Amino acid sequence: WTATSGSCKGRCFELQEVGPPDCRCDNLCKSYSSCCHDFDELCLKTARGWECTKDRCGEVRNEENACHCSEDCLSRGDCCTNYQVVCKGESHWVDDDCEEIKVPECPAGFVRPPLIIFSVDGFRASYMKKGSKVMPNIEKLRSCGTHAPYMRPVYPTKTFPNLYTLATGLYPESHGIVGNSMYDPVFDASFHLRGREKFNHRWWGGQPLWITATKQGVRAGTFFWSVSIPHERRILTILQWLSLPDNERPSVYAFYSEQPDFSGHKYGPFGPEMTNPLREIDKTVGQLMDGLKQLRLHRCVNVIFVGDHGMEDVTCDRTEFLSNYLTNVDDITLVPGTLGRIRAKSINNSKYDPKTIIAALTCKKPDQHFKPYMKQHLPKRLHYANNRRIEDIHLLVDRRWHVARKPLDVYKKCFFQGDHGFDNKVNSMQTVFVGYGPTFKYRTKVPPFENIELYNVMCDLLGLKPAPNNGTHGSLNHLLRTNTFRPTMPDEVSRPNYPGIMYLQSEFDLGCTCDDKVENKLEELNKRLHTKGSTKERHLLYGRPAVLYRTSYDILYHTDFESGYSEIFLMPLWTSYTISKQAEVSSIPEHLTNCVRPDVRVSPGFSQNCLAYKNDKQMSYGFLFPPYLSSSPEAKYDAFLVTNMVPMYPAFKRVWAYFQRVLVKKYASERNGVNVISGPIFDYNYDGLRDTEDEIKQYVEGSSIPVPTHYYSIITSCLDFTQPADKCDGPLSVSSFILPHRPDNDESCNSSEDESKWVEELMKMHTARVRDIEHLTGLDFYRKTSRSYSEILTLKTYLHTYESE
Numbered sequence: 004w005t006a007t008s009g010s011c012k013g014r015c016f017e018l019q020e021v022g023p024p025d026c027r028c029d030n031l032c033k034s035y036s037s038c039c040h041d042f043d044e045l046c047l048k049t050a051r052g053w054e055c056t057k058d059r060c061g062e063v064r065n066e067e068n069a070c071h072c073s074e075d076c077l078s079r080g081d082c083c084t085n086y087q088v089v090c091k092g093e094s095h096w097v098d099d100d101c102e103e104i105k106v107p108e109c110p111a112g113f114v115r116p117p118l119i120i121f122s123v124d125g126f127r128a129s130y131m132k133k134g135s136k137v138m139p140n141i142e143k144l145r146s147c148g149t150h151a152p153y154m155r156p157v158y159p160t161k162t163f164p165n166l167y168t169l170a171t172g173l174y175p176e177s178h179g180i181v182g183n184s185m186y187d188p189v190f191d192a193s194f195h196l197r198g199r200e201k202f203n204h205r206w207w208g209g210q211p212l213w214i215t216a217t218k219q220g221v222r223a224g225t226f227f228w229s230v231s232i233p234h235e236r237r238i239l240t241i242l243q244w245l246s247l248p249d250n251e252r253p254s255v256y257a258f259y260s261e262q263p264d265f266s267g268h269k270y271g272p273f274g275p276e277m278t279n280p281l282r283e284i285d286k287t288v289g290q291l292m293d294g295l296k297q298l299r300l301h302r303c304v305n306v307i308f309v310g311d312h313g314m315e316d317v318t319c320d321r322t323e324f325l326s327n328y329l330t331n332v333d334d335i336t337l338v339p340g341t342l343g344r345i346r347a348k349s350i351n352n353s354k355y356d357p358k359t360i361i362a363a364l365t366c367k368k369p370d371q372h373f374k375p376y377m378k379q380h381l382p383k384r385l386h387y388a389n390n391r392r393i394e395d396i397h398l399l400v401d402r403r404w405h406v407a408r409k410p411l412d413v414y415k416k417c418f419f420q421g422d423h424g425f426d427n428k429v430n431s432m433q434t435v436f437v438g439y440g441p442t443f444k445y446r447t448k449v450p451p452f453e454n455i456e457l458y459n460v461m462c463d464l465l466g467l468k469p470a471p472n473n474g475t476h477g478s479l480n481h482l483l484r485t486n487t488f489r490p491t492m493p494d495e496v497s498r499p500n501y502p503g504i505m506y507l508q509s510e511f512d513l514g515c516t517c518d519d520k521v522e523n524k525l526e527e528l529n530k531r532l533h534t535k536g537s538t539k540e541r542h543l544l545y546g547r548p549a550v551l552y553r554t555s556y557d558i559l560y561h562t563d564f565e566s567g568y569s570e571i572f573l574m575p576l577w578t579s580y581t582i583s584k585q586a587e588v589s590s591i592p593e594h595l596t597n598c599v600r601p602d603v604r605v606s607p608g609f610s611q612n613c614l615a616y617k618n619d620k621q622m623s624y625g626f627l628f629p630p631y632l633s634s635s636p637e638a639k640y641d642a643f644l645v646t647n648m649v650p651m652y653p654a655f656k657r658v659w660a661y662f663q664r665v666l667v668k669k670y671a672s673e674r675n676g677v678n679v680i681s682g683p684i685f686d687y688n689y690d691g692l693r694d695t696e697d698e699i700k701q702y703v704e705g706s707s708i709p710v711p712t713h714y715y716s717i718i719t720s721c722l723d724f725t726q727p728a729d730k731c732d733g734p735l736s737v738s739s740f741i742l743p744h745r746p747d748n749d750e751s752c753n754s755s756e757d758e759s760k761w762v763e764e765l766m767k768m769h770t771a772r773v774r775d776i777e778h779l780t781g782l783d784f785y786r787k788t789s790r791s792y793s794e795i796l797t798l799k800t801y802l803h804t805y806e807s808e
């Protein structure tokens with residue numbers, strides 16, 4: 004209840020929200036059923052429309068008008084945005100040449116350039132090129148400012164998760180807005196786009212930009228606009244707030260447009276009906292820039308033009324139905340559409356089995372347009388698991404498709420021709436970024452980057468300290484003229500040990516054998532220098548990784564590879580090697596098929612043993628440095644050290660062996676050498692972060708050898724591929740992956756075929772950023788390079804996507 008018989012006189016779009024049951028005149032009042040009686044009349048004026056005409060010039064102020072063309076309007080801050088153009092012979096901002104903004108050119112009393120975020124729903128990245136003829140104001144922002152070819156949204160590529168990610172720098176799993184609809188079992192409450200529960204603060208985690216600003220003494224305009232407030236009025240309100248006195252005026256503002264998403268759902272991303280919504284958004288941009296230029300703020304304000312996600316062609320006839328797969332379809336609740344989320348209809352039924360539901364959805368039809376996953380098996384790059392609101396069963400839906408429970412769900416609910424929500428690597432889901440202003444660079448193109456990075460930059464733009472977030476602060480410094488954040492490398496926590504030869508062969512009782520006893524001061528001094536780190540400059544190109552947590556580990560040198568070996572986990576944390584373009588692939592000789600050799604630098608007590616692998620009927624083993632790539636028959640013995648061994652399911656050894664035998668060599672040939680760092684990952688609680696030893700849920704049977712949940716590799720070479728990986732003078736090029744360590748290959752529907760038909764496809768699906776691997780391992784890579792740290796940070800955030808151009 005609100006006693007709505009107070010007044011909005013003098014309060015129109017008040018910045019501080021007053022508490023019920025006093026009536027409201029702030030933006031949001033419409034959405035709460037709480038506007039004062041006279042809100043529409045006073046605050047939502049429309050008389051005479053939105054543009055000055057020649058006859059209105061110097062008119063007698065009529066307070067009823069939407070905007071004014073009277074002489075006093077400039078000092079009142081309430082002119083129509085085109086006032087000076089019609090009545091003072093001024094040009095539109097878009098018709099002016101662009102001129103570099105070297106320093107902020109701001110009115111007196113401005114303590115810092117304001118930030119205006121112009122956010123557009125459903126604005127697919129390719130609209131920038133494809134709609135360029137109808138979007139002159141946007142194209143000027145884009146070519147005169149700083150722009151990326153596209154910006155990667157977060158998964159799911161829905162509206163609410165992406166806008167809140169923009170505001171917080173957090174993955175949806177951390178901020179809690181994990182979809183457009185959600186169930187929270189601890190609350191026992193549901194969140195929906197329609198309705199009232201969405202207004203409860205307990206859904207909304209992290210710290211959004213407006214709260215960060217406020218807590219730090221920077222004033223913020225509203226980020227949420229009521230849908231009934233038209234766009235012209237949102238602009239005029241921002242422009243009015245910008246005319247407030249210094250002590251009252253916000254420093255950060257947001258505009259939001261429901262377009263082009265609204266029309267995109269109806270007509271598809273490139274429907275002929277899409278041209279008009281793009282023209283209209285551009286006109287709104289035009290209104291802002293003309294308005295700012297009137298207030299002499301157009302070389303003062305930083306403007307960000309940013310989308311939440313793109314839009315794909317999706318129709319009713321491209322719907323897979325769970326009823327075509329399951330028989331107990333009534334025992335389930337599906338969150339449907341461009342992603343699937345499945346849970347039990349009743350918490351009272353313990354006859355519901357997630358395992359049988361998954362198997363019933365796995366590889367059942369030759370062209371099947373979705374893939375079921377337990378959430379913890381989703382690609383780690385999605386970061387979509389560590390929240391009680393994300394259901395255990397997830398369906399990743401092919402682009403252009405929907406999933407629904409029963410056919411009745413579609414026809415009793417073709418309307419739609421466009422949708423979004425798919426895997427955030429998909430080209431059609433990409434969206435836009437442009438920055439324009441004194442703090443951004445002039446006429447600069449930057450590489451594509453992820454929307455999680457922007458919060459840090461917006462904080463830098465406003466002189467704020469960002470709350471803890473998932474951005475990598477410094478990785479977007481290259482967007483900025485000034486205001487950069489000078490990041491420093493994290494301090495190493497654990498220094499390595501460098502063991503020499505300390506154990507006799509007979510001290511080991513590991514149950515391992517090797518056919519290796521065959522007996523030279525040329526080649527004895529040779530192996531010696533190799534075990535002290537002589538070829539280490541070849542195999543460790545960027546310094547050793549730093550260990551950022553407290554642990555016990557040894558650096559081990561070898562002719563062909565170097566490793567950091569963990570006495571705690573009994574295996575390397577990392578193994579580093581370089582494979583030149585010229586390198587030869589050889590086979591594992593027959594006599595060495597089952598060879599595992601004691602490492603005389605490492606105690607029996609800190610070594611693995613072969614007996615555990617014999618006894619464990621499910622678990623086998625692989626090697627981190629591949630025997631196939633040894634530089635010599637003699638160097639090959641190093642690859643069979645017990646210290647290079649890691650536990651591997653036979654089903655996973657198929658994947659790993661193909662990567663090591665075929666793909667490493669393919670990459671070296673293509674990229675002119677590669678440096679590879681590979682290792683295990685333990686993430687049993689699927690939080691994206693390195694497990695402590697007490698979190699490990701699985702060991703090789705009857706041993707203390709922990710089983711990894713994943714294996715990673717980071718594959719680096721010269722960006723100028725005319726230079727070999729081992730002698731690169733400039734910027735680097737990287738691709739990485741985090742492969743799930745699974746006892747079956749149920750994920751790959753074509754896995755009974757040759758590895759050449761499926762393995763690389765799997766690896767591509769599990770592409771990763773170096774930064775993802777850092778979180779998962781507590782390691783810090785690229786410590787010793789000739790590149791600036793900001794550049795390295797950008798490299799660590801790079802994702803190799805495997806989408807076409």
Ligand SMILES: *[C@@H]1O[C@H](CO)[C@@H](O[C@@H]2O[C@H](CO)[C@@H](O[C@@H]3O[C@H](CO[C@H]4O[C@H](CO)[C@@H](O)[C@H](O[C@H]5O[C@H](CO)[C@@H](O)[C@H](O)[C@@H]5O[C@H]5O[C@H](CO)[C@@H](O)[C@H](O)[C@@H]5O)[C@@H]4O)[C@@H](O)[C@H](O[C@H]4O[C@H](CO)[C@@H](O)[C@H](O)[C@@H]4O[C@H]4O[C@H](CO)[C@@H](O)[C@H](O)[C@@H]4O)[C@@H]3O)[C@H](O)[C@H]2NC(C)=O)[C@H](O)[C@H]1NC(C)=O
Pocket residue numbers: 173174176177178179205206207208209386389390391471472473690691692778
């Ligand atoms: C992306 O960036 C983010 C932000 O940096 C990273 O997330 C952080 O990770 C930290 C480590 O996981 C985590 O720190 C823990 O926080 C606990 C207190 O947390 C509250 O306070 C903060 C700060 O104001 C707040 O942000 C939190 O908000 C969460 O919870 C509410 C709902 O309750 C949500 O509204 C909100 O969205 C958010 O949810 C998300 O995080 C939680 C976990 O906190 C998940 O459960 C959700 O799924 C969701 O993703 C909180 O309100 C604190 O209690 C922890 O301390 C324990 O662990 C330490 C180890 O140092 C130990 O020493 C202590 O003893 C203690 O253990 C005790 O509790 C245990 C569990 O109950 C119990 O087992 C023990 O026996 C002990 O009793 C811990 O410090 C930090 O909160 C989050 N922050 C956010 C915002 O998510 C994220 O990791 C990044 N991702 C990647 C991939 O890098």
Ligand SMILES: Cc1nnn(Cc2cc(C(F)(F)F)ccc2OCc2n[nH]c(=O)n2C)n1
Pocket residue numbers: 120122162163164166167168169170226227228229230257258259
């Ligand atoms: C979800 C969600 N999370 N954060 N927001 C606020 C918000 C943030 C931005 C930002 F951060 F990119 F700048 C832009 C626009 C925003 O809201 C627009 C809006 N008005 N009305 C309405 O329904 N919406 C969604 N919305």
Ligand SMILES: [Ca+2]
Pocket residue numbers: 685686687688689690691692693694
């Ligand atoms: Ca973990």
Ligand SMILES: [Cl-]
Pocket residue numbers: 159161181182183184338
């Ligand atoms: Cl959703």
Ligand SMILES: [K+]
Pocket residue numbers: 616617618619620621622623
């Ligand atoms: K075995």
Ligand code: NA
Pocket residue numbers: 748749750751752753754755
């Ligand atoms: Na399979």
Ligand SMILES: [Zn+2]
Pocket residue numbers: 125162264265268423
């Ligand atoms: Zn939409």
